[PDB]
């Protein structure tokens, strides 16, 4: 007694209207580690907690490039980010060679979810495990997104995914007011999504080896600080 | 619907998670040792009526000290029943919709509920009337008048019982072993307790960790969240 | 049941279930309505705001299809934009090989034809998504409505949604009490109303309204989106009736 | 444990039931048809039920013109016969192309039959759920009338029903022919057979009908035309007296 | 029942293939039809039953011819041998008369057509 | 009980089991240890022979990629002389069309790349082979950019860098062991005898130069696997600082 | 078959669902605080016994107080048992057309049927002929019956048997353990109301919220709806 | 084999829908107010015994009216158990060839056929002999063998004993529960009667409803049809 | 939630997997040796009984040596069944959280529960009330009782038994085999020792080697692990 005959492939539908492989898909984003990002008017910002084996391997990176103007961080299987990261570098750079013009963030999303799309409405295969954070700048100034495996991809203002996100996404809800205004000044936007990152720790605290930054905006191309240069931070 | 609704309400306010979560920290610290107590209570008892030798007096009386513990016994099983139907007033009234999928949380509730039921059923005892799995249960609560009903029947056949003119006999014996047929029953009937209790101890510490485990999904069985409809 | 399992099998009653599964998970998703005004029409979809961190006026949920097509649902959203994107294809192919614009009722079949497929082999899952949409060709304005079935026929205005019904009472009204065409410009407003009035379904999360229309007099043959002052007029035009 | 879920295993009696369930499908549509033959033309008749203040009847008939000379009527689900409508549709165009002649009913009919048991013997899809009903006029054969079906069966009808009603339809038929001896309706034209179809249904259902709760289509000499809306009011109020 | 005739490339435990006797079955079930082999001639006959006198059974021949010198009849399921027929009667042109200048002999027909019905056994 | 039998096939907590048991496939292998130093890589593996009659030679389970990456397997060996195959021409090709080495890692990835290929349907694109690779990888090399350095590579499709790494049966005691010895001014000739002496204690058998395989890379020399004398004596220079302390 | 159509319609319109709702919002307020009512009044009457000493004297009536409780809920179970089978009555008439399919709601219906048998058992009590799953059930609701049966046995042996003609006598009990029994069969079968009584509100508790949440399914087990047909 | 149709035949025409139809009517409208009636009759028989004082005079003769309650119920299932059989009849000699396809209609047959012997176990009772599912059926059929079986030995140990002369008596019996519980047989077998009736009201309608939907299939569990063979 | 942790921990603290395999030592060694022992006090017992004739001197005393032996054995059963529940209770509060997924050690635990419970029923005994499985094991840990109670009633026929002025005699009896009887009553319980006693053995024995193999993956259902998610 006690079944469930509606959750062995994607391709079919619970008599209630739910796609339960997809479900349990999410539930694996859930399971990987933390990572933020916000933005204000001038920049994009992703803060990611790097996660390891033993005090002898390295800690798993999580933050992407795919253009100078854009990248994410991820949470959840990594091999599949990898896929997604890369069909996005593909997307911007024949955007790019053809016409000649840098791919706009919001396009980024539709892109990603209609290839994340095909996944949950075909035989044989399943869902992409991980959900990403894409920051970017494109000719509508600063932006930022969130991408679920179920194809969904909205468009915030803040936001964390990972196991104890909940407590960030919390923080950064309320200093919103405060944060979408720091313009000009990219010092203070980090400061503040480091502050909303640690609203998420229990273990331990960040170190210099677990921390990692990216930002891009106005006049800073997407560029990635590791370890020993997130220092000012800690 | 809003006064469905309220009824629905009402009742889970009235039984809510700190009413059973209450009832796992006395059987944690409380109800257990009470447990250990009547164990050797009746332990030192069997000792007693090892050392004894039984006479036509002993047939006479009802050994009070044994009365005690029995008692003592029947009481505490009363009790951990009454506080068991609480856990479970609090589970039944959790079960939701009837649904053929999205079972994974209520699947726990009856699983629990299941572990519980058969502490139950060790507590309520076995009885005289019985379920297909017998009575491999040590003894019910009803070890009170099981016992005393044992005994009764032994001693008409020892003092025998009677009339008058000419000799109290009637009938009485000389079968030698109807005779430590007596101490036994005093001695059985203080080894059952024994057992009975050693079992309750793990079943009590069972269902403790069992219910310490799953009382999220025993509370939220299911978690509802639709992020890929809008 | 083993029924309802699979996606090409006949129950005894010649009953598919997955596909009817398919529905239920459409009549749960927001709720899309579609107006048909005398030349041209006009849409409206019902956006959830989960939480403040959500810039407004982005995340849309109305594609125009060529340059002259509305186009709304409800129900699975991925499903959606694919569905679309084949009748862009679709769209597209056509115009280059006829020249003229294609016809809303023609555009019609090849979608119902596309998810027509879905409920034939075993091997993929229907379209989990109802669909409003309409324009305006050569014969005026029309205004469809698909379902996962890929069944669909003309209406006057539909909707469909987790709250549709309140929709639909209160709008067979509109058309008793104006049997003759509603009105271009009323109709938005109109809109925005039938919006809010069937929200209360979702009352404890603050929403947002979008509304895009296709007229040949306000729009000029063209769909175009509604923002802007006549977004919010008729935003007030019925918070005001809301009271 | 699963005979009746594959459409390519036969039961221990060589039935297939996936293609049998495939039938009761054809009788959900809660719509009765039945087609007689002039001596110079061909009338069909089917009921046009509108359950809904909403959609605009225009654009809700199960009787589409795949040439124009040839009509189709069918008894099943809009998606399944619209498709079906639409590879016959084509099957007509390329013929015609590649034979230099228009395509004759009794042939599309077997393209059909014969299509829907490759269809259904190479199990490359599930068997459509509808009866389809061809009429016209043609050159070799004027009254021409032919059915098919999901198993891919097909034969001539001198005029037949289909529906939820068969018998009735069909045996108020055998009894009016059973006289007449012959094996079609006498009259010069078209317009006073249509009358003796609806006449001749009336009697099997027990109701009446206006402009809008029926629906019927005919084929003259080269030339398939569907009877207008308020004209099939015409010949319902001629027939309403010369009772 | 068994386990093994829901499946053509399946052998019983004693190797019988299942779903072919099934099929068979569908043929002892169709109406009843004869063939007599004469001296100087030849005769095939099959019954005809009417689901109603409402419908013209002389639009749906039972009897079919393949070659001017040949023709054909059956028992069992009605849509599968109107095409088997239309299927023989090409890979009687492309498989001898457009190769031979001439119509085929009777018993390489008959195996040209049992080698259609071949394909229909080995595969699932 | 139900979810572990598609490798396309998430469990109610997301989980890819078939996976998984991918892995519990390496812990059958025999140990094989990495241990990084400042000096060169060294790689050690415990051969495990079941019979006198075998040539040990014949099992290669320490091989080399390039001249500057070498590297030791664990779990079925039909599986690795796929990846090491796929590996050296990975490496070979690149130097093609580069003119110049390839990055450690950057081999490394496209070894992961590779069991990233696994799954059987058709939702668009294809990658034919079933399922995962039941072997993981020890790969020691040396480039120019980021010096000496060893890496993990799982079915999973991903990995890991290290100090110093053990896998096998006996990645359990061996891991252990390993995170109390490692430190960063480690001598080379120092990890050889810690190599040498970790296998000796998880593993079983008296440790001869013939069920241990040791071997080791350098940015002068490259991959060279350490012949028998060498390591015979390795063996005994090391049973003897155990007689004192 | 218009005729049959009206049968089925009649059945249906003789018992609503109307009728059943009022059942459960009778036992969450009225009948809920009666069983809370009875747990009591048969709680301080086994204490009452506790402290008391039998002697030949109470052999020679019958304790009223108790018959008063025994029966005061034997009317309760009477009740109940009443109620359910309205329910019941409900349900199994909107038992629709046997088929292989679209049974989603069936499921509900029968899953529900079988919790009200399973409190409907309960209620009914054991007796004393039984089910395979023994008498693990406290005391039926005919405790009166059993009650006095028990009591009635040991009386006689306490009592006396006296048959007579003037020249020889039958005798008085002197078992010492056999007047303790007396005393027991008082305490135990006011305990037995406790329990059952005790249970008897998670169980009730339960079906309401089992009712509750499941009644649209109930009464619709199967929702038409053609629209792809046509 | 035409002799054999013949007698397939002449079965089919004894017992043809109609019979079984009419069963259902008759349910419908008499049969079932009589059960309503046999359930007040028995209701406040049980309220007269409720307000009376026993006495040896009680025990010298058997109450008629509660002879009359229990017989005017045996009379009741008695010709329920033959109409039933009645239904049953039509049904079984319509149960097609065994077949291992086409049994959709076959399945609703034995469906039924099921939920009629459900009835028929009711109604024939427990017995004395039993089931593995015990005896949690009310009260059968045979109400009045097992009352004045109950009622008779206690009727014994009241009376006793009984020679006359009038200066002393015989016996026993001082027991006063003994005499309560002479009290509680008339009042107990009146309250079995309430709900046995109270549940067979509950069966019938539901076998009413069962019937009315799937009678199509029950008479005509294949429906032949070779439209793709020719 | 910081305290229900504690809880949980002070529980596996009390009963570690040391306290489980001290019991297994003791198995090993000690409680073995002892049962071999019970083994052959039993079998020479049952000799003396065969060479041996009995009159009704026999009648008048309880063979003390028999007794010597019943009570050893049911001294070594309390033991077994106490040792066990100890090591039942190890595992039982190591039961993880209830999931449809990484079963694989919790089936483990619960099959060694299953093979402890098989042996605590053998020590248990049958008893007198009966599991479905029937009394197929040997003799319970209650053979005291039951001997005495079986050599009792065979005591009162050969004996007789009296009262006063006629003849001491009054009950009591030819039969040569009632004689003989009770010389096999003394062979027998003799016997079902030796039985008891050596299937006894297998189980410890059994379960010895059940434990010893799977004792890792007990205390450790499940091995996190998460080196795929990051």
Redesign the interface.
Known sequence: MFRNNYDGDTVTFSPTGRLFQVEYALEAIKQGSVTVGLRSNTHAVLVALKRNADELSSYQKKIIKCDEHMGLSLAGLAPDARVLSNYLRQQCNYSSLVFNRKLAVERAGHLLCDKAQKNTQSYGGRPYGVGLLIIGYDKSGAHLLEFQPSGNVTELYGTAIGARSQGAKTYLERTLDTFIKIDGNPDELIKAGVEAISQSLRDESLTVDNLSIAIVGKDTPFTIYDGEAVAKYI | PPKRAALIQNLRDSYTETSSFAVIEEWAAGTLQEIEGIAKAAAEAHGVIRNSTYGRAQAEKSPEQLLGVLQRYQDLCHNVYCQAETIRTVIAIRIPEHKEEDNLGVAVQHAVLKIIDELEIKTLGSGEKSGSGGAPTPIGMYALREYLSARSTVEDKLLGVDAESGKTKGGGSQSPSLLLELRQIDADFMLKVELATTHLSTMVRAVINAYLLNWKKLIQPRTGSDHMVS | TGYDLSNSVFSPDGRNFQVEYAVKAVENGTTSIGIKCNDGVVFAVEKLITSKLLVPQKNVKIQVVDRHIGCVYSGLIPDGRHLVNRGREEAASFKKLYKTPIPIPAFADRLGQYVQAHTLYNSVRPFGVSTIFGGVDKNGAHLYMLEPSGSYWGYKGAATGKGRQSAKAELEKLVDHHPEGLSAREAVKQAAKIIYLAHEDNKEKDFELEISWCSLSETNGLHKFVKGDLLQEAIDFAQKEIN | AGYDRHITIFSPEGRLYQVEYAFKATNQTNINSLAVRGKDCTVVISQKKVPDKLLDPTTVSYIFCISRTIGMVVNGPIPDARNAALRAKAEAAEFRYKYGYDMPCDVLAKRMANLSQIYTQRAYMRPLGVILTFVSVDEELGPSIYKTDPAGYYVGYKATATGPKQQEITTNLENHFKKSKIDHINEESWEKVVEFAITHMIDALGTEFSKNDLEVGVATKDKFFTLSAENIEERLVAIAEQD | ?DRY??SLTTFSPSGKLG?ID??????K???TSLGIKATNGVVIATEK?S??????????SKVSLLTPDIGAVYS?????Y??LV?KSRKVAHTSYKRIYGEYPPTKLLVSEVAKIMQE?TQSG | SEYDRGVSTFSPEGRLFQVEYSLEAIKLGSTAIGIATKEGVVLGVEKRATSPLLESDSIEKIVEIDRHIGCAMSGLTADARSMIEHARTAAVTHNLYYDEDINVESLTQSVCDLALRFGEGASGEERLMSRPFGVALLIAGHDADDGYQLFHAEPSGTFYRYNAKAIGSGSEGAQAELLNEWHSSLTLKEAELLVLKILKQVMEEKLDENNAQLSCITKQDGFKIYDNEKTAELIKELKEKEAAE
């Open positions: 029942t005739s829901f779903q099934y099929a068979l079955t569908a043929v079930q169709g109406v039953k689901s109603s006198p409402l419908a013209m059974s002389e639009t749906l069992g399921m009605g849509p599968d109107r095409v239309d229909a």
